[PDB]
Structure 1
């Protein structure tokens, strides 16, 4: 219902990866699937993800965050990878079940 939806928004501001300018999928741990996905990213979307991180890293090193006005907002967060990933995973799931 509109609970999980008002919950998710909270948690999102809670994790606070926005304070660093990082999109939801910027903080993803890079296992084999993700790796694969990231390689399928359109030239730009990747060069962009890149900056964001090299910038976040620069922050964590300085110990500071972004001024309030530059933070990502729960609804303006672009899940630029989620689709490519579910495909990688979908693809893999196949190869696996087919080898029997």
Structure 2
């Protein structure tokens, strides 16, 4: 699935009061049990990156965000191989779990999808 799809569907849910009332609490528990924060990751660090679109989005990250992402991946790799969890300031707090990459990938995909549409235009 594309990030665009995921973001649009999520926005439909967040709009509907009923839907948000039942989905948002579930999503928060899901994230707590997921446990990626206990390896010091942010949610966006987990997104598959071996695609042209994602490689382009990663290249457009500001240098500081890019250097920090590299460190979180290396740190999480070291927790994984040691069979340990983060402690203290290495644990990602909910307020630090920012969607740093989502705006870049949504722009890359917007152009990619517009290009696909425009490749199929028919002069009326």
CA contact (8 A) 2:40 2:90 kept: yes
Distance 1:56 1:12, change over 3 A: same
Matched, 1:48 2:74: no
Return the alpha-carbon distance in structure 1 between the equivalents of residues 89 and 108 of structure 2: 35
Kindly state the Cα deviation for residue 68 of structure 1 after the two structures are TM-superposed.
5.6
Higher RCO, 1 vs 2 (CA within 8 Å, ≥6 residues apart)? 1
Return the alpha-carbon distance in structure 2 between the equivalents of residues 23 and 64 of structure 1: 17
**TM-score, structure 2 as length reference:** 0.74
Count of aligned residue pairs for this structure pair:
100
Unaligned segments of structure 2, at least 5 residues: 1-19
**TM-score, structure 1 as length reference:** 0.91
CA RMSD in angstroms comes to 1.4
Kindly state the Cα deviation for residue 75 of structure 1 after the two structures are TM-superposed.
4.0
Matched, 1:22 2:45: no
Return the alpha-carbon distance in structure 2 between the equivalents of residues 13 and 73 of structure 1: 11
1:4-23 Cα deviation digits (max 9, x unpaired): 11111111112111110000
Q: Choose 1 or 2 for highest CA Rg.
A: 2
Unaligned segments of structure 1, at least 5 residues: none
Aligned structure 1 segments of 4 or more residues deviating by more than 4 angstroms:
none
